[PDB]
Amino acid sequence: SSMADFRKFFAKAKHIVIISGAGVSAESGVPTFRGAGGYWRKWQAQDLATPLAFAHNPSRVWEFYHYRREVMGSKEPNAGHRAIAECETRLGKQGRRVVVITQNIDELHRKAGTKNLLEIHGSLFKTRCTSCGVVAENYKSPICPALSGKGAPEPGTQDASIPVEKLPRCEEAGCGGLLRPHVVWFGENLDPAILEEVDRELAHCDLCLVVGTSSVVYPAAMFAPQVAARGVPVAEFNTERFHFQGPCGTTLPEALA
């Protein structure tokens, strides 16, 4: 039904799951690399976010992720992210739970103040050593000196073609292994531990929100339907149970007041 009917459910909901999609990041001007304007140079983003592309050209893969890390400098969380964060803070002092399950890798939910965050696809600001497996936070600009001035999005740009030795290297003593971005690539599974946390949130929630994506599309498809099958209401906020059409920065400040 209406927004007034959603607010009734929202006022009584004690454990809210928020499934956050690409729409939420696109509203902050964050480049998504899906759709028609989801291109970097002469390749598809799907072409680069793969174990195969990193094995054959780690320099080109690192140039792509270096760009994505650098564009975040000028990006700020929108009214959607803020309303989500303030909602968690406020409801937490009332002994009620708000959890954000996101596929976004830009950390804007983290900058807005969301604490209960599940980043199922990893983060741009995390590296993983291909030799020792250590996962680490990395906000350094540029991530390595050979990547200084590299990663121009424009097609025609020559490959930086950095030797593997000069790409980001693990700083753990005696390792020096090749680092990769700590993100889920095409053909890779989600971390089972992260999946267990997700499963647990979905099974205990009394309200579920799907924002800047829909329930009939991945990853919200692996999550939101089994919530609706338990009887629990699902509200979708998108540019396309309850459904609310429009930007998240418009509908969420209101819904989550």
Q: Where along the sequence are the contacts to Zn ion (CB under 5 A)?
A: 129, 131-132, 170, 172, 175, 177
Q: Is 121 a catalytic residue?
A: yes
Residue 27 marked in a binding site: yes
Residue 100 marked in a binding site: no
Considering the complex, state which of residue 10 and residue 125 has its C-beta at the smaller distance from Zn ion.
125
Residue 131 marked in a binding site: no
**Token match 């696809």: residue?**
121
Shortest Å, Cβ 178 to Zn ion: 9
Q: What is the largest CA-CA distance in the chain?
A: 61
Considering the complex, state which of residue 68 and residue 180 has its C-beta at the smaller distance from Zn ion.
180
Residue 37 marked in a binding site: yes
Of 56, 121, 204, 243, the active-site residue reads: 121
Which of helix, strand or coil describes residue 78?
coil
Shortest Å, Cβ 125 to Zn ion: 18
d(CA 217, CA 230): 19
Shortest Å, Cβ 126 to Zn ion: 14
Which of helix, strand or coil describes residue 182?
strand
Considering the complex, state which of residue 132 and residue 203 has its C-beta at the smaller distance from Zn ion.
132
d(CA 54, CA 143): 17
User: Buried b / exposed e across 126-161, counting CB within 10 Å, b at 16+?
Assistant: bbbbeeeeeeeebeeeebbebbeebbeeeeeeeebe
Active-site positions read 121
